Design a binder for this molecule. Structure first.
Ligand code: NAD
Ligand code: NAD
Ligand code: ZN
Ligand code: ZN
Ligand code: ZN
Ligand code: ZN
Lengths: 374, 374
C-alpha cells in the first residue's frame, strides 16, 4: 500500500500566531525505528490547541497542532512491538517511556520525554517528519494529530480495544482522562465531599462527572456562560452559580454557602485570577485545590504564605495523573463496559475541512467538544 | 491554700514593642466554668513568642507570652471533667474543641477556638484573667505561660504522665511535635527517600528526627550557622550543607545533587526567600513542600502556576498536624517508652527571672532550646 515510501496527504498548518489554519498538502516521511505512522479517523479541538494560536503557549512555528485523537496503524518501525499494522490506537500527549525517575514512581506521570516543560517541536529522536512547500513543519506535543497521517513514537502511542468507536473514544486522549482523573485520581475526592469546579468546558465537565463518581455530597459548578449549566446539572451538578449575579466576589459567595470553604476546588479554565478564587474558596484548614488549566505564558500570581500555613494543600498535574500507555487501554475498556458516557460532551461533528469553524464555535461558546472527521 | 481567689505573683510583662520584658506583679483571677489555673514550673523560649516582640506577629499589647510549658493543676473551674488538681499538665497552643468542623474532620487540627489565625488575646469566652497596675493584660495564644500562674481553658490543656520530668518534657508543647509531625504526619515521608530541611533551631531539629523516624534515606540539612551542623549530623542528617560555601543558588545546588529535586522539603525558618527556595528544590513531577515557619507580617510571594501544574504539592501546618488533646499525651507516652531524647535539643536552663538573657541567647545562635525553670 504506502508503507516504506512517503505519503503525501493534507493537514491544517499553523504558520502565524493569531492567524487561521491552512489546510495544505504536506509530505509525511517514513516511520523510523521505535516509531509508528498512524492514519486518523477523528480528532477533537481542545482549548490547549487554542493556546498556541493565541500566543498563550509558546512553541516553535510553523506547527501542526492536535492531540485528542484516534486512528489506525499503517506501518511500524523496526522493533516496534506494542502495536502492529491494522491496530487501533489513541496517541498519548505525554508518554510513559518506562525507564525514567518519574515513570518509575507509581505516583508520577510527567515522563521526561514530554514536550510541555520546554517545547522542542520535534519527536524524541531529535527530528521532524513533515515538509510542506519544502519548509519542514514542527510536531505539537509529540502527537500532531490535525493531519491525515502522523508519525509518533512507540512509547507515546496507546493501543485500544479493536471494537472501540473511534469517533467517541477519542476524547479519552485529553478531554475526559484529564478532568475525571483530576477528581478520582489527583484530588483523591472523598465520598461525602463538597467540591467547587470552575470552568464548564469538555475537560471540566469530566471533572464534574468524576466528582459525582467519587461520591460528592455537593458539586457547585461555576461559569460565566449560562448555557453551560444545563449540561453540567445533567452530569452530576447539585448547584450551578454564575458569578456575574453578585455584588460580593464569588470566593465570598462560595464560602458562605459551604461553611467557609468547599472540600475540593478545581480550576478548568486556565487564568491567573480564577486560580486564586479556587484557592480562597476551599476550607482554610482542610481544602485542596487542583490547578488543571494551563495558564498564560510568563505571568505570576501573588500569595501570602498564611493562606497555606493553616493547612490548604495546593497542587496540579498533567493528564489527570493517569499513566498514558498503561491507563488509557483501561479507560477505553471502561467506556466499552458501559461504565460512563462521552456522548454528553461531543456537541458537533464537522469534517476536517471545517477545522477553523470548530475553532469559532469554541470561541463563541456553542461547543462542549467539536469532533473533526477524516 | 493558694487557691480560692485572685493570686498575686510575678510575670513577664511585654508593655511595648521591642522592649525588654519586665517582671512585675500581676493578679491571676480564679478559673471560671470549665477553666483551669495551672502553676508553671518549666517554660521554653520559642521564636514564635519572639515574633511578637519584633512586630512580625501583631498581637494586642500589653501582653503575657509563652506557650511552651509544663506545671501542675492547682484550682479547677466548675464543670471540668478532663483534668483535676495536682495533675502534671501541659497547656496547648491550638484547642481541640471536639465539636467544630475542623475538629470533627479526621485530618485537620486547626480548631476554631484559636487566636492563632485571628488574634483577640482573651480566653475563649471573651474575658481576660490578669491585671497588673490596675490595668488589664491580654494573653498570647490562649496560653501565656511566661508567668508563675496562668488560667487556661479546658479544651486547650493536656493531661500527662505523673512521672514526667517537667523541665524537659515541656518541649512537646510546640518545638518537638511541630517538627516531628511535619515529617511523620503531614509531608508523609515515605521510606528510602531524600528530604531537605532548611533551618536548624529546636523545631527544625525535631523535623530532622521525624524524617528519620519515617525512614527516608538521604536527609540534607541546609543552614547558614555552621555550628548547628554538629548536632544536626549526629541527630540524623546525612549531609548538612551551608548556603554561603556556594556560588550557585541553593535550589539548583540541591537540584543537581539529588537528580533534579529532593522528595520532601520543609522550611523551618520564616524567611520568605526560603519558602521559595524550598519549593523549587523538590522534584517537579512529584515534589512536596511543607511550610512550618511563621512568615513576617504580610510579605507575599509571587509564583507562577507551572511549578505546580507538573506535580509539586505545596501545603502548610500547625502542631505537626497532631490534634492537641489527643496526640501530645500519646507522644509523651512514647517518650516515657524511651522513643526519643529531648536532652539533645536543650542547650541552656535559665532561672525564670533571667527571661531576658534567654532571648539574647536565641538571637545569638548559641542555643537550640533554653528552659526557664520557675
Ligand atoms: N491538565 C491538563 O492535563 C490539561 C489538558 C488539557 C487541557 N487543559 C487545560 O484545560 C483548560 C480548559 O480546557 P477546556 O477543554 O475545558 O475548554 P473550554 O474553552 O471549552 O472551557 C473553558 C470554560 O471556562 C469558562 N469561563 C470563561 N471565563 C470564565 C470565568 N472568568 N470564570 C469562570 N469560567 C469562565 C468558559 O465559558 C468555558 O465554560 C485549557 O485551557 C487547558 O489549559 C489541561
Ligand atoms: N507551625 C507551628 O506549629 C510552629 C510552631 C513553632 C514555631 N513555628 C515557627 O517556626 C520557626 C522556627 O522556630 P525555632 O525556635 O526553631 O527558631 P530558630 O531561630 O532557632 O530557627 C532558625 C534557623 O534558621 C536559620 N536561618 C536563618 N536565616 C536563614 C536563612 N536565610 N537561610 C537558612 N537558614 C537560616 C538560623 O540559622 C537557625 O538555624 C519560627 O519562625 C516560628 O515562628 C511554627
Ligand atoms: Zn518516562
Ligand atoms: Zn488537550
Ligand atoms: Zn512555638
Ligand atoms: Zn474545634
Amino acid at each position: 500500500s504506502t508503507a516504506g515510501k512517503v505519503i503525501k496527504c493534507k493537514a491544517a498548518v499553523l504558520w502565524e500566531v493569531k492567524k487561521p489554519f491552512s489546510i495544505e498538502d504536506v509530505e509525511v516521511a517514513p516511520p523510523k525505528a521505535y516509531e509508528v505512522r498512524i492514519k486518523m479517523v477523528a480528532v477533537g479541538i481542545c482549548r490547549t490547541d487554542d493556546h498556541v494560536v493565541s500566543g498563550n503557549l509558546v512553541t516553535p512555528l510553523p506547527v501542526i497542532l492536535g492531540h485528542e485523537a484516534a486512528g489506525i496503524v499503517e506501518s511500524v518501525g523496526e522493533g516496534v512491538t506494542t502495536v502492529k499494522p491494522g491496530d487501533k490506537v489513541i496517541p498519548l500527549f505525554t508518554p510513559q517511556c518506562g525507564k525514567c525517575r518519574v515513570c518509575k514512581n507509581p505516583e508520577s506521570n510527567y515522563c521526561l520525554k514530554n514536550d510541555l516543560g520546554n517545547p522542542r517541536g520535534t519527536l524524541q529522536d531529535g527530528t521532524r517528519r513533515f515538509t510542506c512547500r519544502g519548509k519542514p513543519i514542527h510536531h505539537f506535543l509529540g502527537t500532531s494529530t490535525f493531519s491525515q497521517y502522523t508519525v509518533v513514537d512507540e512509547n507515546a502511542v496507546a493501543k485500544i480495544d479493536a471494537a472501540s468507536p473511534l469517533e467517541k473514544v477519542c476524547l479519552i486522549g485529553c478531554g475526559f482522562s484529564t478532568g475525571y482523573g483530576s477528581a478520582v485520581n489527583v484530588a483523591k475526592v472523598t465520598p461525602g465531599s463538597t467540591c467547587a469546579v470552575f470552568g464548564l468546558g469538555g475537560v471540566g465537565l469530566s471533572a464534574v462527572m468524576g466528582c459525582k463518581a467519587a461520591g460528592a455530597a455537593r458539586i457547585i459548578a461555576v461559569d460565566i456562560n449560562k448555557d453551560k449549566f444545563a449540561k453540567a446539572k445533567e452530569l452530576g451538578a447539585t448547584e450551578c452559580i454564575n458569578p456575574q449575579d453578585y455584588k460580593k466576589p464569588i470566593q465570598e459567595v462560595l464560602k458562605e454557602m459551604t461553611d467557609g470553604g468547599v472540600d475540593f476546588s478545581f480550576e478548568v479554565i486556565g487564568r491567573l485570577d480564577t486560580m486564586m478564587a479556587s484557592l480562597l474558596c476551599c476550607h482554610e484548614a482542610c481544602g485542596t485545590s487542583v490547578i488543571v488549566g494551563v495558564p498564560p505564558a510568563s505571568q505570576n500570581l501573588s500569595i501570602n504564605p498564611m493562606l497555606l500555613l493553616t493547612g490548604r494543600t495546593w497542587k496540579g498535574a498533567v493528564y489527570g495523573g493517569f499513566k498514558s500507555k498503561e491507563g488509557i487501554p483501561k479507560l477505553v475498556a471502561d467506556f466499552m463496559a458501559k461504565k460512563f458516557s462521552l456522548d454528553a460532551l461531543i456537541t458537533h461533528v464537522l469534517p476536517f475541512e471545517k477545522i477553523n469553524e470548530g475553532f469559532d464555535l469554541l470561541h463563541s461558546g456553542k461547543s462542549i467538544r467539536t469532533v473533526l472527521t477524516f
